[PDB]
Assembly symmetry: D2
Homo-oligomer: 241 residues x 4
């Protein structure tokens, strides 16, 4: 039996960087995704090329039926689910106005209900000694206009993380969250000018763009031996901004 990690949202960006790093750390990685198979398959093949073991599973993490199937299928691979990382989410902009109610409902459904289901199923499947890690966001501290629905969904996620840490008392399972700022994903760089990039690179005291690998290394600390006494924590990974 190989130790096994399930990562939601693992086809691109931070989730993919997490999948890759956990594979390097020796986990068999289930690359969970919802949309097109192509990026998830790219992730899987990259992991295997570098010497790891991984496979991809499609599931809508906010669909209760698909999530049930996802956890049954993922646990059947190696008979175990040691680590669950919930990284999937969406970040649309919408101000707090009645016309934004559809966007609100979508964000809450995808990010918060989604997180609830992944956490609930993880709490029923993870062994003693396991680890559950959720992705939140640094932007909660800034409360920027149009980030209301997104921040509300992720504040909810953090509340669930802290309560689940207490509900799993006796099982030696840590529950934590990692809250990145923006990172230099391919989508980030394509959708911006060199000038917007330069402006954002100046914001942190470290004065550079953060990378997905830099988020994944903290997630990997939480998933491994150095993270065993970290529990019910939200670690912000944002370069100091």
């Amino acid at each position: 039996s190989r130790k096994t990690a399930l990562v939601t949202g693992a086809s691109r960006g931070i989730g993919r960087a997490i999948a890759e790093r956990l594979a390097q750390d020796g986990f068999y990685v289930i690359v969970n995704y919802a949309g097109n198979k192509a990026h998830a398959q790219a992730t899987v093949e990259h992991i295997i090329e570098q010497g790891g073991q991984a496979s991809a599973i499609q599931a809508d993490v906010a669909n209760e039926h698909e999530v049930s199937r996802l956890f049954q299928e993922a646990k059947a691979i190696n008979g175990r689910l040691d680590v669950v990382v919930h990284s999937a989410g969406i970040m649309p902009m919408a101000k707090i106005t009645p016309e934004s109610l559809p966007d609100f409902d979508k964000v809450i459904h995808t990010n918060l209900r989604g997180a609830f289901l992944i956490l609930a199923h993880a709490a029923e499947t993870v062994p003693d000694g396991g680890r559950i890690i959720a992705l939140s966001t640094s932007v909660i501290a800034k409360s920027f206009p149009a980030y209301g629905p997104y921040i509300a969904s992720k504040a909810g996620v953090e509340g669930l993380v802290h309560v689940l840490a207490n509900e799993l008392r006796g099982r030696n399972i840590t529950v934590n969250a990692v809250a990145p700022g923006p990172t230099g994903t391919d989508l980030f760089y394509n959708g911006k000018t060199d000038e917007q990039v330069a402006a954002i690179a100046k914001l942190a005291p470290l004065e550079r763009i953060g990378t997905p690998d830099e988020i994944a290394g903290v997630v990997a600390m939480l998933a491994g031996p150095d993270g065993r006494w970290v529990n019910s924590q939200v670690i912000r990974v944002n370069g100091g901004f």
Copy 2:
């Protein structure tokens, strides 16, 4: 020769038929607001709140609306503003607190709590942002239990943490309008609902949790809300004030 007596302000209070919301409605009426007592189900308690307000020399009326239904919320704000032609203060106190662990079996509860407490709060805050004048006040009720992360409070805490996030973002979105947005987060409070199921020993055990060693009253929550709604709260903005006796 108060501005409140020269031109009377109007306050809408959701969840005002009982508990903390009733205490808020009564306090704001005694401060001179015309109060719209908003309620969801049977009107007897809401009418009791209105009648108490009027018997103490105040002004108030009641409007039925499910704060979690978008059409009923739009209608509530139309009718509330039409009473006096203005809607100066909005206090959102409606909500539910069921116990449910983070498990697949709790999915219905979670959906209901999020729907009632978080989406409901969105609808009220959004409509308040559309209706309140410059200089107005928006106040939501959160909860002190966020600090404790007790088992079975997951859905409830997630909903109220979400409300607090909306509060801070809205305070920023209303830049330029001179509208404060704040929340008040009580601990356990001596409402009818608090006392009803509990033995004297269980009440005493709760009283011992705070260094003040008693049960806090609904009026003690309402006083803080009243501060936020009036002149002394002019420079308090995007804050969550926990009112819990030190627990």
Copy 3:
């Protein structure tokens, strides 16, 4: 004061000669407290505060004491309590805000602010803990700038974060005495000192930082202190209330 010209309660306000402390002393005197205007250096401003309180119909007197001096603080509390027999409310607003980066050359200024702001706070809180009757109130002033961690604010922030830590522990240490301990954390405020250190352009820039887009006033801080000192603050305990316009 009542018919017998006895003030219903007595409040000691440190740093009450000017600024926020003066606004606090004036507001508490208006609310019916006898006020000890405490001061450290020269008494002209403190005496001016006392005379304004008396002219408005209150009772006040100024007492000299360096809050960081153990013996002068002992004498301060003995004298303050002796005026009416009780010291009901203690507000600690005296403090300094020198700017110094975290470098070895800044050690003197660090030592100064720690001595004045933190040790001072410890003395006032400790003596307040020993002097205030059951039912009393203890209120320290902190700062909103802790949230920002701006360069050169290191020593100041460290002293005020220490104060908040003392506040929370003291609220638990006074369990059983019905004494609330809280802090109020102003943002930038339109005081003499504040304007001395800024150009008009700098003031305008600071004003636009809050969604309310102005500078806060001392009276707007004092109103929240007065809430904590009076009936509407009875269930607020171990809290730091930030009063900054949403900054």
Copy 4:
């Protein structure tokens, strides 16, 4: 002799010693700073060297400005560099917030807060671009227990300095962070306790065991190494969930 070098205050025993040991295992030459008797610091240096590392011990009172100046001179001179600085020295006496506690208060603030101010300040002048500065705080700030007033005040002050220094070092690529442990299973911890008292403490965390100093040191190691490059201005609580 251009080996990456870490200075650890309070490295004689407990968490500081575990930090020194882990950083040596991670490849740093370690300066074991101590204040009082040399014996435990020497034991730490000897253990590091015997495990295949490089280390030496420097005596200095962290709260004395003249001795801290000397300490940073000596520490930088070993290898011409001071890449990582971990401030772990501190004291935790109990004293209620009362006038009679003024001496204890003065002692804690001087040793824990002024001490931290000196180390941080000298670290800001010494650490190279890309360096790391890490202070030890405490999880007990959250609990505000009676008699912990002076201690909590000192450590909250430390945290404020950490956040400000992170902004003051803009442009230098230096992270500043803090690790805030709960109680930990040191020799001194176990000394004053029976089986039953340790069992009562072990029940507190949801993980239901006693935390170890190595478990703190591993988070410090994360912050000092590649995986902590983007963690900046953070206080990480390491307490098993309690």
